[PDB]
A paper describes a structure:
S. scabies produces a 200-residue, 22-kDa protein that is a single-domain enzyme called Scabin. Scabin has been cloned, expressed, and purified, and shown to harbor dual enzymatic activities (GH and ADP-ribosyltransferase). Scabin targets DNA as a substrate for ADP-ribose modification; it also shows enzyme specificity towards genomic DNA from Solanum tuberosum tubers. Scabin shares nearly 40% sequence identity with the Pierisin family of mARTs.
Scabin active-site residues proposed to interact with the ds-DNA substrate include Val109, Asn110, Gln111, Thr127, Trp128, Tyr129, Trp155, and Gln158 (DNA I strand); and Gln100, Asp102, Glu104, Ser105, Leu108, Tyr129, Lys130, Lys180, Lys181, and Arg183 (DNA II strand). The rest of the Scabin variants showed either a WT-like crystal structure or similar CD spectra to the WT in solution. All the structures were of high quality, ranging from 1.5 to 1.75 Å.
Residue numbers in the entry: 40 to 200
Amino acid sequence: PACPRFDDPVHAAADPRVDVERITPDPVWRTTCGTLYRSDSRGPAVVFEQGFLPKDVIDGQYDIESYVLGNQPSPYVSTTYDHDLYKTWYKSGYNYYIDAPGGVDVNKTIGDRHKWADQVEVAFPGGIRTEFVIGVCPVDKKTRTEKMSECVGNPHYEPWH
């Protein structure tokens, strides 16, 4: 089955003050609805209550290539198509599982030749409300593996397809 499409390209946003017209270059929006992932040090006690909030929606770096290459504060919350990218971010103690519409497909938007194209990123302008955060798995730092008996579902997750 194909995915439902919301009319609002930032329907998912935790911070709706994000300014879609300030995004550069012109974004190529993700139209698939597979699970995405985010390595984050922040704990589920916080993420499940707040969602993923972006560092700066008003004065942050709205330029995608600038944000990818130099992680200045931005209106974006980064995620990945790649379940296993947490192995590269071993320091972050969690691999979050996300089921959210939309997002800017970084490689479709700025190409797949830049330094970080292997990150297969999707950038959420305005972040990601908790209802789109499936859950989380803690990461064992020494083996770069998920502690699967310690995964936790987000009580606020609301399936939508």
